[PDB]
Design a protein around this ligand. Structure first.
Ligand SMILES: CCCCCCCC/C=C\CCCCCCCC(=O)OC[C@H](O)CO
Ligand SMILES: CCCCCCCC/C=C\CCCCCCCC(=O)OC[C@H](O)CO
Ligand SMILES: CCCCCCCC/C=C\CCCCCCCC(=O)OC[C@H](O)CO
Ligand SMILES: CCCCCCCC/C=C\CCCCCCCC(=O)OC[C@H](O)CO
Ligand SMILES: CCCCCCCC/C=C\CCCCCCCC(=O)OC[C@H](O)CO
Ligand SMILES: CCCCCCCC/C=C\CCCCCCCC(=O)OC[C@H](O)CO
Ligand SMILES: CCCCCCCC/C=C\CCCCCCCC(=O)OC[C@H](O)CO
Length: 446
């Protein structure tokens, strides 16, 4: 009645942080590799194919945000029950989360399918452009349930500390999508819609593995059955108090990027937006280790909170920050030193401005862990609303705010955008860190 994952969660927090975060970073790196490769295949199909992907992209990211939001709500709620040695509670959360995956996933499909035509056209698309985007979108929308299920499955695994399988499920899915991409797009000649089917099939296979582990081998720590299922308002509210604000955090980010783009356009037009796009994509690569660490932090602080061990929660939180800080130091030094080389490789025009960008913009990555791990621990203790507030403050008030100030009130132009983004992120990192310290001392008094 105990797994390696549960032993890990109930063990030394530093050991748990390292194991989980390495596992998440590996899984997320394969997801990143898939994305880069798919970007390349699609690029060679022409403007009409890119524009079709472009039309669906906000919807698709919205679907990811909802799925991953439910996943982290699930992870946190399970980790806390396990820490509290509430086995029946952990079982019931898992069952609840799986029923929610069906409700959410299918709702996404049935709501968007009849909406996408009007949506794409309202975006300014006409005739053939509309038709191609719909062919592409409907394949992916068909798998909305699968996506949510996979994310919930991953959430359950992370919640009970099973770093190994959570990682494996990510590797299998993105790895299979990497294999199927050139075969569906070019070999079978399906073009852009081929990329959608490669993705749909990859997700289906992932779900088959997860369903096998959960329902056939039944070798997770949590027991999952409908025989023992009694609807719980408290469980539903617990999941959504982390899950909904997590999803909304992605929305805040998306809105922020829109404004950031408009500022880049104001400063540099098509040239400026191109430089920003490239510099941001490269800098977001440095974000990957932080995300893996955040996922670890949520599970580990959750378990500690359930155990009512504030010392343990604080240790995991601060150790996560320290490790992410060190990693980011190396990442930033690397990009800063090798900016011309890095630019050369991602461009194949905008070289000089991109090099400047790569030697200013990535600086904020060094302070990101202080805010992001705080957000992850807020989620671990179940207070997702605080994580959302911090996310809004960083992305919309600080990032966009300062970027706007430097461009409208100074003569820095493009460089002012990078500087504003850096300054904004760093202020938010300090505020978030201070809030986390305050929250923790409050815990010690409670
Ligand atoms: C519990 C597991 C937690 C992760 C531990 C390491 C897992 C896989 C590394 C093996 C392959 C490493 C290759 C890196 C690329
Ligand atoms: C409710 C189900 C009905 C269907 C809803 C489908 C999703 C659109 C919310 C998070 C939004 C995330 C913002 C999108 C990020 C874009 C980058
Ligand atoms: C949470 C329980 C309620 C679930 C909600 C069921 C959604 C209804 C389905 C299709 C109509 C909406 C699509 C209308 C878009 C047309 C443009
Ligand atoms: C454009 C070029 C793109 C190149 C694309 C390369 C794709 C590499 C994919 C996976 C390897 C990454 C390392 C994966 C390590 C996984 C370790 C693991 O999952 O362990 C399972 C566990 O041991 C169960 O017993
Ligand atoms: C190919 C994809 C296969 C994925 C299938 C996903 C089904 C999950 C939905 C509800 C399960 C609800 C709890 C089920 C409890 C099982 C024991 C009774
Ligand atoms: C949005 C529907 C979610 C369905 C979740 C299935 C299990 C029921 C759990 C709590 C119900 C509490 C009543 C809230 C209305
Ligand atoms: C994971 C748990 C916390 C999620 C918080 C949501 C924030 C996402 C912004 C992504 C990083 C953006 C870097 C520049 C701002």
């Amino acid at each position: 009645k105990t797994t390696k994952g549960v032993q890990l969660l109930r063990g030394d927090p530093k050991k748990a942080i390292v194991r989980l975060s390495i596992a998440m970073m590996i899984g997320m790196s394969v997801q990143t590799l898939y994305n880069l490769a798919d970007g390349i295949w699609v690029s060679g199909l022409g403007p009409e194919s890119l524009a079709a992907v472009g039309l669906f992209f906000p919807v698709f990211m919205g679907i990811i945000a909802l799925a991953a939001g439910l996943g982290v709500g699930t992870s946190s709620a399970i980790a806390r029950r396990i820490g509290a040695r509430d086995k029946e509670g952990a079982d019931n959360v898992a069952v609840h989360s799986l029923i929610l995956s069906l409700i959410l996933g299918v709702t996404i499909t049935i709501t968007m399918l009849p909406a996408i035509d009007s949506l794409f056209r309202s975006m300014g698309a006409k005739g053939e452009a509309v038709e191609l985007a719909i062919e592409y979108a409907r394949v992916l929308l068909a798998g909305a349930f699968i996506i949510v299920f996979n994310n919930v499955g991953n959430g359950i695994l992370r919640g009970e500390g099973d770093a190994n399988r959570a990682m494996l499920a990510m590797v299998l899915g993105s790895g299979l999508n990497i294999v199927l991409d050139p075969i569906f797009i070019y070999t079978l000649g399906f073009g852009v819609v081929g990329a959608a089917y490669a993705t749909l099939l990859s997700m289906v296979v992932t779900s088959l593995f997860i369903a096998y582990w959960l329902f056939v081998k039944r070798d997770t720590y949590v027991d999952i059955t409908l025989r023992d299922f009694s609807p719980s308002r408290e469980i539903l509210k617990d999941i959504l108090r982390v899950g909904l604000p997590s999803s909304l955090s992605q929305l805040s980010m998306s809105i922020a990027m829109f404004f950031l783009n408009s500022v880049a356009i104001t400063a540099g037009g098509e040239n400026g937006v191109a430089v920003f796009t490239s510099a941001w994509r490269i800098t977001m690569l440095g974000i990957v280790p932080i995300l893996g660490m955040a996922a670890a932090t949520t599970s580990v602080t959750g378990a500690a909170y359930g155990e009512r061990n504030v010392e343990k929660l604080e240790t995991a939180y601060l150790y996560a920050i320290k490790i992410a800080f060190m990693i980011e130091l190396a990442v930033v030094a690397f990009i800063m030193l090798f900016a011309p080389q890095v630019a050369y490789l991602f461009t194949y025009v905008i070289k000089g401005d991109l090099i400047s960008a790569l030697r200013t913009l990535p600086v904020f990555l060094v302070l990101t862990p202080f805010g992001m791990m705080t957000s992850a621990m807020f989620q671990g203790i179940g207070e997702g609303e605080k994580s959302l507030i911090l996310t809004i403050f960083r992305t919309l008030v600080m990032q966009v705010g300062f970027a706007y100030i430097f461009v409208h009130y100074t003569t820095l132009g493009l460089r002012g955008v990078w500087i504003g983004i850096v300054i904004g992120n760093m202020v938010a990192a300090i505020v978030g860190f201070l809030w986390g310290r305050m929250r923790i001392s409050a815990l010690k008094k409670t």
